[PDB]
Chain A
Amino acid sequence: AAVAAGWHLASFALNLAFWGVEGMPPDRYWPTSPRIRLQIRPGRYGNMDGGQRVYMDYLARSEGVPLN
């Protein structure tokens, strides 16, 4: 059991030694926004004028601003 756990622990330690993106250059086959890479853009229907309102607070829901 110790060996079979130490494998996962070594892998987790290795993934920890990364710590971020410092050292990682940009890449053009892999942007950071999935919508650019996947060519996703809204159309005409399903467009509510006061839907933008909702949009804002959803952003405000995740940008963590407890005002909302």
Chain B
Amino acid sequence: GERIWAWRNRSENERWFWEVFAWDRLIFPILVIVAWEYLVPNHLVWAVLAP
């Protein structure tokens, strides 16, 4: 318990990163845009305008 207390006091930034930032604001939007552009034929109405 003491070790977990000391470790929680020194890693607040990393904790918030892995719980709130890693997927929702870093990996998911990258994946979503690349996935959409892999499908969706090479027009302009589909590749730029509707995105």
The count of residues in chain B whose C-beta lies closer than 8 Å to any C-beta of chain A is 6
Give the dominant DSSP class at A's interface. loop
Contacts of B19 on A, CB cut-off 8 Å?
A: 29
Give the dominant DSSP class at B's interface. helix
**Is the CB of A46 closer than 8 A to any CB of chain B?**
no
Q: Which of A2-58 contact B (CB under 8 A)?
A: 25, 29
Within the assembled complex, what's the spacing in Å between the Cα atoms of A29 and B15?
10
Contacts of B4 on A, CB cut-off 8 Å?
A: 25
Within the assembled complex, what's the spacing in Å between the Cα atoms of A29 and B16?
9
Within the assembled complex, what's the spacing in Å between the Cα atoms of A43 and B12?
36
**Is the CB of B51 closer than 8 A to any CB of chain A?**
no
